[PDB]
From a paper:
Other molecules closely related to the thiobarbiturates were identified as interesting binders: barbiturates 11 and 12, triazine 13, and condensed bicycles 14–16. The X-ray crystal structures of compounds 13 and 15 confirm their binding, again showing the sulfur atom interacting within the lipophilic tryptophan cage. Compound 15 can establish all of the interactions previously discussed: in addition to the interactions of m6-adenine, it can interact with both D422 and D528. Unfortunately, the multiple interactions of compound 15 do not translate into a very strong binding (IC50 = 86 μM). Moreover, in the present campaign the crystal structure of [name] in the complex with compound 15 guided the derivatization of compound 14, which has a similar scaffold and binding mode. We were not able to determine the crystal structure of 14 in complex with [name]. Thus we hypothesized a similar binding mode as in the crystal structure with compound 15. Figure A shows the two reference poses obtained for compound 14 compared to the crystal structure of compound 15. In pose A, the carbonyl oxygen interacts with the backbone NH of Y418, as observed for the crystal structure with compound 15.
Author numbering: 400 to 548
Amino acid sequence: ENLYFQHMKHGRVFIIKSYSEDDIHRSIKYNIWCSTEHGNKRLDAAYRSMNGKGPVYLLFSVNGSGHFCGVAEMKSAVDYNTCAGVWSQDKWKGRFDVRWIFVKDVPNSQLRHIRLENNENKPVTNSRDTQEVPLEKAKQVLKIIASYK
Ligand SMILES: O=c1[nH]c(=S)[nH]c2[nH]ncc12
């Protein structure tokens, strides 16, 4: 639907791939997330360089689920020294705030014809955790998720 995301002139969009639906549920409940060590650094740099000029959006998907499960906006820098063991595995260390926008399952069939020119033209549905999405393809994904019924 062209009602959604028609004014995102700046900003950046990443794929989040979780091993745990329970971690997603905790993220939705408390509006926080944590990535890999390298993923935290990549999101941190994107959020910091944006300096509030636009949104950093996160497109969430559970590994193996065959569907994306929602969209959240990054709402803080990464805090690296935080309470241990709050997620499904102890290896998830650190925290940043998010704001969930959509919580809805969207089948990969609706998205797999969107290909990423920064990832060897592979379907967006074949992305790994914290793959960055070109802005014009991200707008396409965001509108599909937003309007899917
Ligand atoms: O399974 C996960 N759980 C948390 S909390 N963060 C993640 N990043 N990538 C995968 C995961």
